[PDB]
Amino acid sequence: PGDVAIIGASCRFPGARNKEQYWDNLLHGREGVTFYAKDEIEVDETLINSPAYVRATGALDGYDEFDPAVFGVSDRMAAAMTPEHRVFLEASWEVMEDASYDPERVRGEVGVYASTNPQSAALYSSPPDWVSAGPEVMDRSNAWLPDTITSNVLYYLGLTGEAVTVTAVCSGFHYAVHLACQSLLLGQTDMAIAGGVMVRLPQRRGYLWEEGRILSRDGHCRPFDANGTGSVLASGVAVVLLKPLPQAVADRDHIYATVKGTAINNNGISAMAYGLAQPERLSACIAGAMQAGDVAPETVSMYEANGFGMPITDSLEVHAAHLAFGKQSGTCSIGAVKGNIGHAGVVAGGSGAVKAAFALYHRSLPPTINLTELNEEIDFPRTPFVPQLEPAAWQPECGIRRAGITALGGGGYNAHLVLEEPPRPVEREPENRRPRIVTLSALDDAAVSRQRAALSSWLAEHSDARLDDIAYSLNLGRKALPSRWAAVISTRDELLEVLSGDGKSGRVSRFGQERRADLARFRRTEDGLALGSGDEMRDVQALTELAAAWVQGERVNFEVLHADERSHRISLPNYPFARRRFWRTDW
Amino acid sequence: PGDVAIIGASCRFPGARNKEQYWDNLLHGREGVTFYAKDEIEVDETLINSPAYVRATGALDGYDEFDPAVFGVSDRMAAAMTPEHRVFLEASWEVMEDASYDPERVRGEVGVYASTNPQSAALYSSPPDWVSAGPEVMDRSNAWLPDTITSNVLYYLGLTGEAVTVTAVCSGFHYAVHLACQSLLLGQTDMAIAGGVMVRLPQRRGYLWEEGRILSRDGHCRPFDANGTGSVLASGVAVVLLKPLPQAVADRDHIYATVKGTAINNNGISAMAYGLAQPERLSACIAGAMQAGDVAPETVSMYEANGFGMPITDSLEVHAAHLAFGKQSGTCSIGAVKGNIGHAGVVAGGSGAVKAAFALYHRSLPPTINLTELNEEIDFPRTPFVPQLEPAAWQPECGIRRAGITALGGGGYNAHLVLEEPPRPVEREPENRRPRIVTLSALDDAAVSRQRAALSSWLAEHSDARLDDIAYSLNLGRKALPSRWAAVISTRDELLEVLSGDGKSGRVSRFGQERRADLARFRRTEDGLALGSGDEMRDVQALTELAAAWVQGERVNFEVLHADERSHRISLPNYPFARRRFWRTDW
Ligand SMILES: [K+]
Ligand SMILES: [K+]
Ligand SMILES: [K+]
Ligand SMILES: [K+]
């Protein structure tokens, strides 16, 4: 009754600049950890020559890159913002795009719940000084405080709602999703942006190996392996857009998976060393999440573990999951994504949750890598869990696909969330052949051309995408920006041709160069221009003039254009951010 | 005897990127202080809106620019070096060029004495950590420690001698020049590099006015004015090359001025507030400097004062100078360069000293600016000093031109140095009409082209420069660098012709493209290739082969080329440093 749908997703991880790259890497079992030479590391002069220094890390490509003009941010402010502020702000923009929701036109309350690492801000620059209360002081505070990582999203995306920032160490992503779902179930918001960000500073840096501790000795992470010595430190970002399941189905959204239940607790007085799971407290967390979503352990066929790669910590976590599943659970696939990318800190739980969501969406199970000798002490044949050594189709005897993801952190933080595969797709009516308007807008002309190239490339990969879904998503899911482009077409092949080249071969492009659009033809609505009659909305000349009026900069009511058909929102390419490098120069 | 010659100079001050630009500004009474709008200052968020905040400073253009390849420095090391390390190192290279001395061919011991501000390094980056003793740690120490500002000059220029760094607050330049002269008079070195550097961090910054203090209320410095309220903070660098006067005349060097005497002391227990000159202690300093050089107060016709611009501080200094001059001194021109540029900290005494050296060299007196109401409390008609309101030719009733410069700082630091005009130029033998080789070398082709552009402009400005001096200075006073250019010409007008355009219209260019050089034509010497006869060294075709062999990278003995003539070293354009910005990214 309290299911929450994941209708948009955005992430960046070691070796992946977007979610499609991340899922493709997981499918092929790639390792995203980077190894450096001594001269490639320009910090830790005192440690670089130690025999225990491991020159390996999970780097985040473009951690210092940002496109402030798209957000209305000045260059001065972009350098003042911590890298976590910028990376999370850019991911929030992308997650609204992936769900095809224009924040300017969202009619409801949107909550932004995120988790961040305050240690990064303390290393990036000195904190704000509150000796005076001028507007330049407030700008500096909004650039540095972790409290405004979520607030700046509401402000710069044009949303209205509530913002909550939490700091929960290595359980950050799960705690954000947990609090977001409480906001939705109590009716405080209509949809929620939830995620976390982790940018380790210094970025290009190794670590010091110490025997018996969580950091790996060779730079490789080997979950559930007998020869595992730990993990690698990683950076990344992961954001999801959450919406109640009945509403997401009613609005014909694109659903990756649904959140059945979440649970949090703390080890408390029953404390362990770092990474060591206390069986009683962690199992209560795992069982509580399954109880919240009314799912029985017999129905959960995938378990995404924390999995540092240490024999003792991996053994305790598998034991805790066993206590929560019981004996009669059956069989379940177990894996740990940390073998692929390392320990991503605040967003470590996000890497597992995003992997499980895409696993449920594509009905595939990605492998766990760096596993050559199974840990005999765990005794997997005596447990419900089977290590996923190879990729495989997900066809459970249970009948339903459900996953559980666990996040462990320092300070005793525990968290577990349970996901279910998305609802079965409804039968679609055949697509009407009629002229449609498609729109693209960006900040400058060069970015619009990148959007056209990105859109044409996407069309080849997704040949089964309907045109009425494409136009509906582009027209109602993107912000209207100054440099604009539009076309009126009827088939997918016409769309591919007008996008090609300079993009000026379409009737709308030739219309705008010859004559200006006559607005007296249209009727004014509260949301913009509309056509005068229902018959006019199938006339090529009427639709061409309306699209040209939009290209000239007028506001068009796209809701009434698609009012007669029940199209679906689909996932389209993100904005092609021009990524200038920004870094503070004064401490 | 005990007189020390200034045979080379290099400086950068507010509004001047080199000494020629600096003297031209002083001659025209220009002010080099910069005034900013609020949005142009990106620091001091807590103060930018205060009514007492003055958006004025003496900026040092390119304080972050460096050309590490010219010095053999890596990009990583260039970012680790503090701006004072880079600026002073670049200035030492320039002072060797200005004096026409190639460090590879200097046979003697060179001392490097500099003054620096340790406050600047502590603001630029965290200090080195000595928990281990690796080579990367040693590189970081040499990049940060003030002790290595002088060592890096000796190492990176290829010199051998001694290096001494002193910290004497706002009298740093004088203390460096003072110690250099003791080093020369005791015979420990043959030439000495002396100077100071001041790079204020943050650079683009205003200041806070406090009533009754040294900082100006409107951003203008008005020395000796009744309405003066103080000075502005400035950054800069000034370096001079010192050599005993009898040797400098013997080696036909280029002499700006000579140092007659120097003196230092401290206020000690008889302390004052900042900027206030104690009459008894400062006068003893001024009198001691003139006694060291055996100069009588009757002969000093120019006094360059500290002159903050406050009536009370100006009154104490003019009185202290009066006590040292006595009654029988006569009349003397008094001025303060701080009215032009502000208080340059470590190098403030250098800005006045460099002004005095150029005044003696050009036999001209530049005016003191921002002076509208003379301070009536300073009974100027009853003193030997006359405020230099207008530029004027320097023709003293004394018969000899001598100047005195005072530098005051915090902590009681006092210093005074007395300069004399250079010796009268001797009658020169007429210039031989013969073919000459001229050479230019840098690290890449674009820099060599900049050298050609700089030399073509210089030839127009200095139409009285002899061609045999130009060739002598370029061939024997500049380091041979990988990217090379040479020409064989007989007059100044053909020299201007080969430099023009792409520089490939010359005789040497056609030889190098046609054939590679035949080394069998030349005789090998310990200093490089030489021509077979003295007649060949005056043959256009033989000189072309020798020059082309040099452009191809062979070593040429330029000493035997000029052995028959006794030419002079002259001042030619400095290296055209590629202006890349380097700044640290991790604290
Ligand atoms: K709980
Ligand atoms: K109308
Ligand atoms: K700066
Ligand atoms: K003394």
Coordinates of C-alpha atoms in Angstrom, one line a residue, chain B residues 57-292:
Chain B
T57 CA 45.6 48.6 -4.2
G58 CA 48.9 48.5 -6.0
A59 CA 48.5 45.3 -8.0
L60 CA 51.3 43.3 -9.4
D61 CA 50.1 42.1 -12.9
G62 CA 51.0 38.5 -13.5
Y63 CA 51.9 37.7 -9.9
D64 CA 50.8 34.1 -10.7
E65 CA 52.6 33.8 -14.1
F66 CA 55.7 31.8 -14.6
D67 CA 57.6 30.0 -17.4
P68 CA 59.0 26.9 -15.7
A69 CA 60.5 25.4 -18.8
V70 CA 63.0 28.2 -19.1
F71 CA 64.4 27.2 -15.7
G72 CA 64.1 23.4 -16.0
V73 CA 61.2 23.3 -13.5
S74 CA 58.3 20.9 -13.8
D75 CA 54.7 22.0 -13.8
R76 CA 54.2 20.3 -10.5
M77 CA 57.1 22.2 -9.0
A78 CA 55.9 25.5 -10.5
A79 CA 52.6 25.2 -8.7
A80 CA 54.3 24.3 -5.4
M81 CA 56.5 27.4 -5.5
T82 CA 55.2 30.4 -3.7
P83 CA 54.6 33.5 -6.0
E84 CA 57.6 35.2 -4.3
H85 CA 59.8 32.2 -5.3
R86 CA 58.7 32.5 -9.0
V87 CA 58.7 36.3 -9.2
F88 CA 62.2 36.6 -7.7
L89 CA 63.6 33.8 -9.8
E90 CA 62.3 35.4 -13.0
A91 CA 63.7 38.8 -11.9
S92 CA 67.2 37.3 -11.3
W93 CA 67.2 35.9 -14.8
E94 CA 66.3 39.3 -16.1
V95 CA 69.0 41.2 -14.1
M96 CA 71.7 38.9 -15.6
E97 CA 70.3 39.6 -19.0
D98 CA 70.1 43.3 -18.4
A99 CA 73.8 43.4 -17.4
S100 CA 74.7 41.2 -20.4
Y101 CA 76.2 38.4 -18.3
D102 CA 75.7 34.8 -19.4
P103 CA 75.6 32.7 -16.2
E104 CA 77.1 29.7 -18.0
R105 CA 80.2 31.9 -18.8
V106 CA 80.6 33.8 -15.5
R107 CA 83.9 32.6 -14.1
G108 CA 83.6 34.1 -10.6
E109 CA 81.6 33.6 -7.4
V110 CA 78.2 35.2 -7.5
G111 CA 76.4 36.1 -4.2
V112 CA 72.6 36.2 -4.1
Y113 CA 71.2 38.4 -1.3
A114 CA 67.4 38.8 -1.1
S115 CA 64.7 39.8 1.3
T116 CA 61.3 38.1 1.4
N117 CA 58.0 38.2 3.3
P118 CA 57.4 34.9 5.2
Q119 CA 53.8 36.0 5.7
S120 CA 53.1 35.5 2.0
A121 CA 54.3 31.9 2.0
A122 CA 52.2 31.0 5.0
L123 CA 49.1 32.2 3.2
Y124 CA 49.9 30.5 -0.1
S125 CA 50.0 26.9 1.1
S126 CA 50.6 24.7 4.2
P127 CA 54.3 24.3 5.1
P128 CA 56.3 21.2 4.4
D129 CA 55.9 18.2 6.7
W130 CA 59.3 16.8 7.8
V131 CA 58.0 13.5 9.1
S132 CA 59.9 11.7 6.3
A133 CA 63.0 12.7 4.4
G134 CA 62.2 11.6 0.8
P135 CA 63.1 13.6 -2.4
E136 CA 59.6 14.7 -3.0
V137 CA 59.6 16.2 0.6
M138 CA 62.8 18.0 -0.2
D139 CA 61.3 19.4 -3.4
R140 CA 58.4 20.8 -1.4
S141 CA 60.7 22.4 1.2
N142 CA 62.6 24.2 -1.5
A143 CA 59.3 25.4 -3.0
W144 CA 58.1 26.9 0.3
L145 CA 60.9 27.8 2.6
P146 CA 62.0 31.5 2.4
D147 CA 65.6 30.3 2.9
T148 CA 65.5 28.8 -0.6
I149 CA 64.5 31.9 -2.5
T150 CA 68.2 32.7 -2.8
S151 CA 69.3 29.1 -3.3
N152 CA 67.0 28.5 -6.2
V153 CA 68.5 31.4 -8.0
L154 CA 72.0 29.9 -7.7
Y155 CA 70.8 26.5 -8.7
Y156 CA 68.4 27.3 -11.6
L157 CA 70.6 29.9 -13.2
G158 CA 73.7 27.7 -13.0
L159 CA 75.7 30.0 -10.8
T160 CA 78.2 29.2 -8.0
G161 CA 78.6 31.4 -4.9
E162 CA 76.8 32.1 -1.7
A163 CA 73.1 32.7 -0.9
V164 CA 71.7 34.6 2.1
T165 CA 68.1 35.4 2.9
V166 CA 67.2 38.1 5.4
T167 CA 63.8 39.2 6.8
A168 CA 63.8 42.9 7.8
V169 CA 60.1 43.8 7.3
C170 CA 59.7 46.9 5.2
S171 CA 63.4 47.6 4.9
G172 CA 64.2 44.3 3.3
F173 CA 65.7 45.6 0.0
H174 CA 68.1 47.9 1.8
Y175 CA 69.2 45.2 4.2
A176 CA 69.9 42.9 1.2
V177 CA 71.9 45.6 -0.7
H178 CA 73.7 46.4 2.5
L179 CA 74.9 42.9 3.1
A180 CA 75.8 42.4 -0.6
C181 CA 78.2 45.4 -0.4
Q182 CA 79.9 44.0 2.7
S183 CA 80.3 40.7 0.8
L184 CA 82.0 42.6 -2.1
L185 CA 84.2 44.8 0.0
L186 CA 85.5 41.9 2.0
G187 CA 86.3 40.1 -1.3
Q188 CA 84.0 37.1 -0.7
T189 CA 82.2 37.4 -4.0
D190 CA 82.9 38.9 -7.5
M191 CA 79.3 40.1 -8.2
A192 CA 76.2 40.1 -6.1
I193 CA 72.5 39.8 -6.9
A194 CA 70.6 42.0 -4.4
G195 CA 66.9 42.7 -4.1
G196 CA 63.6 41.9 -2.6
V197 CA 60.1 40.6 -3.5
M198 CA 56.7 41.4 -2.0
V199 CA 53.5 39.6 -3.2
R200 CA 50.6 40.4 -1.0
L201 CA 48.0 37.6 -0.6
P202 CA 45.1 37.9 -1.3
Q203 CA 46.3 40.1 -4.2
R204 CA 43.1 41.7 -5.6
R205 CA 42.1 43.3 -2.3
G206 CA 41.3 46.6 -0.6
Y207 CA 41.9 47.6 2.9
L208 CA 40.1 49.0 6.0
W209 CA 40.7 52.7 6.9
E210 CA 41.1 53.5 10.6
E211 CA 41.3 57.0 11.8
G212 CA 44.8 58.2 12.7
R213 CA 46.6 55.2 11.0
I214 CA 48.9 54.7 8.1
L215 CA 46.3 53.6 5.5
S216 CA 44.8 56.3 3.3
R217 CA 41.1 57.3 3.6
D218 CA 40.5 57.8 -0.1
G219 CA 43.1 55.5 -1.7
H220 CA 45.5 58.2 -2.7
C221 CA 48.9 58.7 -1.1
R222 CA 49.8 62.4 -0.7
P223 CA 53.4 62.7 0.6
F224 CA 54.3 66.0 2.3
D225 CA 50.7 67.2 1.9
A226 CA 48.8 68.8 4.8
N227 CA 45.7 66.8 3.9
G228 CA 47.5 63.5 3.6
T229 CA 45.9 60.6 5.3
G230 CA 48.4 57.8 4.5
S231 CA 49.3 55.3 1.9
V232 CA 48.1 52.2 0.0
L233 CA 49.5 48.7 0.1
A234 CA 51.5 47.6 -2.9
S235 CA 53.3 44.5 -4.3
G236 CA 56.5 44.4 -6.4
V237 CA 60.0 43.1 -7.0
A238 CA 63.3 44.8 -7.5
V239 CA 66.7 43.2 -8.2
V240 CA 70.1 44.8 -9.0
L241 CA 73.4 43.3 -10.0
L242 CA 76.3 44.7 -8.0
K243 CA 80.0 44.8 -8.9
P244 CA 83.0 46.8 -7.5
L245 CA 83.4 50.0 -9.4
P246 CA 87.0 49.8 -10.6
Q247 CA 86.4 46.3 -12.0
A248 CA 83.1 47.4 -13.6
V249 CA 84.9 50.2 -15.6
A250 CA 87.7 47.8 -16.5
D251 CA 85.3 45.2 -18.0
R252 CA 83.4 47.9 -19.9
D253 CA 80.1 47.2 -18.1
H254 CA 76.9 49.2 -18.3
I255 CA 76.6 51.3 -15.1
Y256 CA 73.3 52.9 -14.0
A257 CA 74.7 54.4 -10.8
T258 CA 77.2 53.5 -8.0
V259 CA 76.5 52.7 -4.3
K260 CA 78.6 55.0 -2.1
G261 CA 77.5 54.0 1.4
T262 CA 74.9 52.1 3.4
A263 CA 73.9 51.9 7.0
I264 CA 71.4 50.0 9.1
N265 CA 70.2 50.2 12.7
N266 CA 67.1 49.7 14.8
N267 CA 65.0 52.0 17.0
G268 CA 65.5 49.6 19.9
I269 CA 64.2 50.8 23.2
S270 CA 63.6 54.2 21.7
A271 CA 60.6 52.8 19.8
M272 CA 57.8 54.6 18.1
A273 CA 54.5 53.6 16.5
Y274 CA 54.5 52.1 13.0
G275 CA 55.7 54.6 10.4
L276 CA 57.0 57.1 12.9
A277 CA 60.7 58.0 12.4
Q278 CA 62.7 58.5 15.6
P279 CA 64.8 61.6 14.9
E280 CA 68.0 60.6 16.8
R281 CA 68.1 56.9 15.6
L282 CA 67.2 57.5 12.0
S283 CA 69.6 60.5 11.6
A284 CA 72.4 58.4 12.9
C285 CA 71.6 55.9 10.2
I286 CA 71.5 58.6 7.5
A287 CA 74.8 60.2 8.8
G288 CA 76.4 56.8 9.0
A289 CA 75.6 56.0 5.4
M290 CA 77.2 59.2 4.1
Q291 CA 80.3 58.6 6.4
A292 CA 80.8 55.2 4.9

